[PDB]
């Protein structure tokens, strides 16, 4: 067990016992970084994350080795993840496509199962009961419930809500818990939305986002505090600050290998995957429904799958105005060979500077050997080009150009206020 939480700068894993402070998992970080959604795969010692600066979903071991991407194609503001550990399906919520997607990890297979939402945020799925829950915070705010296959969508909590940011589930009692950030409250109810109850006032909670339930504690993240706070899961509780000064803070999650235990008919033994090709989804009252990816239809047997190009034609990775990377991502067509890795695979900066693959107008081209470099690297006193074309015959004329009389002038022709001299 350990507490897994996300932020702008890093994805971290922390022991629950506040007595010790050191991480149990390597931080996840990049040069451009804004992590939001997270979840874990206990059977592989694996976590997942999104990064809104790259629009990719990743997977990485706890040790840090074996980073791989899940997808990079048609992701728009992936505000949350959740993982069905029995079916091995990953669900996410595109706040920009305004939809929720499910993907099977065994072989990349994806469908938008719910499509016409307004501002969906947290999603959480309960494999043994076969339900998924998601929050929407458009004016008529609500919490939905649906069968894991993305059908029977119906609201279970639509009264006295505004901004219902984070959902979570108590596995030990089959109670849904949720934050609301417009009335500054945390509530809980049965999976049917009945028997609704409210926790007491929490000190200095003003706007919560992430929520988690583990053992007898409720873990919450407040954007106005920029902290992780802990309360007793039955009542107002003894508000105990876990972390502070954690920058822009996002979801929390409780890593627990004991939780990820069980089997629906979707992965009972003596057969595989509940006999479905491509997907099976656990459905409430101990049953399974098969699924098919985009562009495929279930056959007469309702289990095996067939091509359906008539209704859902095959689609390109990218439009006519964008370059499809080797990675599933998509970049503007004039970002090819600009000297900057935009595809996050160096796929847009491959074999550049040749005929039929010229440098962008923005970049500077080395005269020999086919290498394009960023414009900002042209004559900045560093030999960037392999042949040194970028540091040859550029203006030395500082000219009679002068900074205002208010500003002191350095020998480098940079100017600063006279107030800054000799500090």
């Amino acid at each position: 067990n350990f507490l897994l939480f996300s932020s702008k700068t890093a994805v971290r894993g922390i022991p629950f016992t506040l007595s010790t402070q050191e991480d149990v998992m390597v931080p996840v970080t990049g040069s451009p970084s804004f992590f939001v959604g997270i979840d874990f795969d206990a059977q592989h010692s694996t976590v997942f994350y999104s990064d809104l600066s790259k629009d990719i979903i990743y997977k990485q071991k706890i040790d840090g080795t074996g980073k791989e991407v899940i997808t990079a194609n048609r992701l728009e503001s992936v505000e949350c993840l959740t993982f069905d550990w029995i079916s091995r399906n990953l669900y996410w919520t595109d706040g920009g496509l305004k939809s929720v997607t499910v993907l099977r990890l065994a072989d990349k297979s994806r469908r938008q199962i719910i499509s016409n939402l307004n501002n969906p945020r947290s999603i959480v799925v309960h494999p043994t009961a076969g339900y998924m829950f998601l929050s929407d915070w458009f004016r008529p705010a609500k919490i939905m419930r649906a069968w894991s296959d993305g059908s029977h969508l119906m609201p279970i909590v639509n009264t006295s809500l505004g901004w219902p940011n984070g959902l979570a589930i108590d596995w030990s009692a089959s109670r849904l818990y949720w934050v609301d950030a417009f009335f500054d409250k945390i509530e809980h109810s049965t999976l049917d939305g009945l028997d609704r109850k409210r926790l007491g006032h929490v000190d200095q909670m003003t706007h919560p986002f992430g929520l988690t339930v583990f053992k007898d504690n409720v873990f919450i993240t407040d954007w106005r505090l920029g902290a992780i706070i802990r309360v007793r899961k039955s009542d107002g509780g003894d508000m105990t600050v876990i972390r502070r000064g954690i920058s822009s803070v996002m979801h929390v999650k409780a890593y627990d290998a004991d939780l990820q235990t069980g089997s629906n008919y979707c992965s009972q033994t003596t057969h595989a995957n509940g006999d479905c090709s491509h997907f099976c989804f656990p459905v409430p009252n101990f049953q399974r429904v098969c699924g098919c990816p985009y562009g495929m239809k279930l056959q007469r047997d309702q289990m095996t799958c067939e091509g359906d190009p008539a209704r859902e034609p095959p689609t390109q990775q990218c439009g006519s105005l964008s370059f499809p990377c080797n990675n599933g991502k998509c970049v503007p067509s004039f970002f090819r060979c600009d000297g900057v890795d935009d595809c996050h695979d160096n796929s847009d900066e491959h074999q550049c500077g040749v005929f039929n693959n010229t440098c962008s107008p923005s970049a500077f081209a080395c005269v020999r050997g086919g290498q394009c470099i960023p414009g900002q690297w042209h004559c900045d006193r560093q030999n960037d080009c392999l042949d040194g074309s970028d540091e040859q015959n550029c203006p030395t004329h500082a000219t009679s150009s002068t900074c205002p009389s208010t500003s002191f002038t350095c020998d480098n022709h940079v100017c600063i206020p006279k107030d800054w001299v000799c500090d």
């Binding site: 008919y265 003596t270 057969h271 509940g274 006999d275 049953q287 429904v289 007469r300 309702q302 289990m303």
Partner: protein, 423 residues
């Protein structure tokens, strides 16, 4: 009328099936989950007719056989061919049973070697080769010998609808199919089944549809036997307890002078305590004579042939000679025989709910007006507190002959307000 999504002909007896029920040609609606699954449920096979199961497709949650039937998903890989085509047991990778200690059945079922021919079929395999009943060569009376394997099974399960023997002796055409059971038996109509002559017409339902009890059964429910006494309530009792001093029939039919109890002279050496009255039996067995218990109404059985009692200073000494504890005083019970315990008492009044009689006796409120003289003086059966005056049925209320008097706007309105149109 055009039943079953207007695709089918059913005789129009005016009654209809529900929304979720299939209709058969002969009626007896069946639930949609029973439609097309190898089980005949309509009797005529309307739920399994090839025409009906031609267009029908399996519900999303049910396994589809290669044949086209729709079995519940939990039937898949359960060793046992319920699909008929074995299409739900095809491809099943069963665990290899430890053959050194278990037995691997012909259907792949794992069972301990100790359970081989242990007395009952465990494998249930198509081969049936578990329950060969190895050690004995035959079965004795109070059971039939099963035919090809020698299991002791009562004929009482012949033709009953499942193979009790695992061998067809309980389904043998040799019997039940040929002629109607043994001389000591009768055959049920539903299921088709030989059953004992002491189930047939016995006062209870023993077939599934009660065809063992079809209204014409002996004289009556109190037909009993030449060895059994006959009771007005329909109960049958042993003739030994007739006029023994206590109700055995359950309706006092064996304890009255109305039929016969005038000469209830008891068996052999029983002491005849003539002090006893019909509320108790005069004859008492010598088994508990002088046993220290007040068998007779005044406990003369404890002095007539009994050793004297020394009694105790801590117990109530009856003036007559009996000895009892202080718990047996002031309780309306003649423990001492000479009423020495109840004489001179000052019984405190009855409880809040408790009813009081004229003779001061306390009786439960529930025991008022039940045709039993529970007060002894008949206080609980007094006309004034027991008779319920019929409603006055004034102006606005017409007393029709049924007694259920109706509103006077309804007189001869041609709507049957009072049973057989009494208005």
């Amino acid at each position: 009328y055009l039943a079953n999504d207007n695709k089918y002909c059913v005789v129009d007896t005016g009654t209809r099936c529900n929304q979720l029920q299939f209709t058969c040609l002969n009626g007896h609606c069946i639930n949609q989950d029973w439609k097309c699954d190898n089980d005949n449920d309509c009797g005529d096979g309307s739920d399994e007719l090839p025409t009906v199961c031609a267009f029908h497709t399996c519900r999303s949650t049910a396994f589809t056989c290669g044949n086209g039937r729709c079995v519940p998903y939990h039937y898949r890989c359960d060793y046992y061919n319920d699909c008929g085509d074995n299409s739900d047991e095809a491809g099943c990778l069963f665990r290899n049973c430890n053959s050194t200690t278990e037995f691997t059945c012909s259907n792949g079922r794992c069972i301990p070697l100790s359970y081989v021919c242990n007395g009952i079929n465990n494998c249930h395999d198509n081969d049936t080769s578990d329950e060969k009943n190895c050690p004995p060569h035959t079965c004795p009376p109070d059971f039939t010998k099963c035919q090809t394997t020698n299991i002791c099974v009562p004929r009482a399960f012949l033709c009953d609808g499942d193979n009790d023997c695992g061998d067809g002796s309980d389904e043998n055409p040799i019997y039940c199919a040929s002629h109607t059971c043994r001389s000591n038996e009768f055959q049920c109509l539903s299921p088709q089944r030989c059953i004992p002559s002491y189930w047939f017409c016995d006062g209870e339902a023993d077939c599934a549809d009660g065809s063992d009890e079809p209204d014409t059964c002996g004289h009556s429910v109190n037909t009993c036997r030449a060895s059994q006494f006959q009771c007005d309530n329909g109960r049958c009792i042993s003739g030994n307890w007739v006029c023994d001093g206590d109700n055995d029939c359950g309706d006092m039919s064996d304890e009255d002078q109305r039929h016969h109890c005038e000469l209830q002279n008891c068996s052999s050496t029983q002491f005849t305590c003539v002090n006893s009255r019909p509320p108790n039996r005069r004859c008492i067995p010598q088994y508990w004579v002088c046993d220290g218990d007040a068998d007779c109404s005044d406990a003369l059985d404890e002095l007539q042939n009994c050793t004297m009692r020394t009694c105790s200073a801590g117990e109530f000494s009856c003036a007559n000679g009996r000895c009892v504890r202080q718990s047996f005083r002031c309780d309306r019970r003649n423990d001492c025989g000479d009423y020495s315990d109840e004489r001179g008492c000052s019984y405190p009044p009855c409880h809040a709910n408790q009813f009081t009689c004229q003779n001061g006796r306390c009786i439960p409120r529930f025991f008022v007006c039940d045709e039993d003289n529970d007060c002894g003086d008949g206080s609980d059966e007094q006309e004034h507190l027991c008779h319920t005056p019929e409603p006055t049925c004034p102006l606005h209320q017409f007393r029709c002959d049924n007694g259920h008097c109706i509103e006077m706007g309804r007189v001869c309105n041609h709507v049957d307000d009072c049973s057989d149109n009494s208005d």
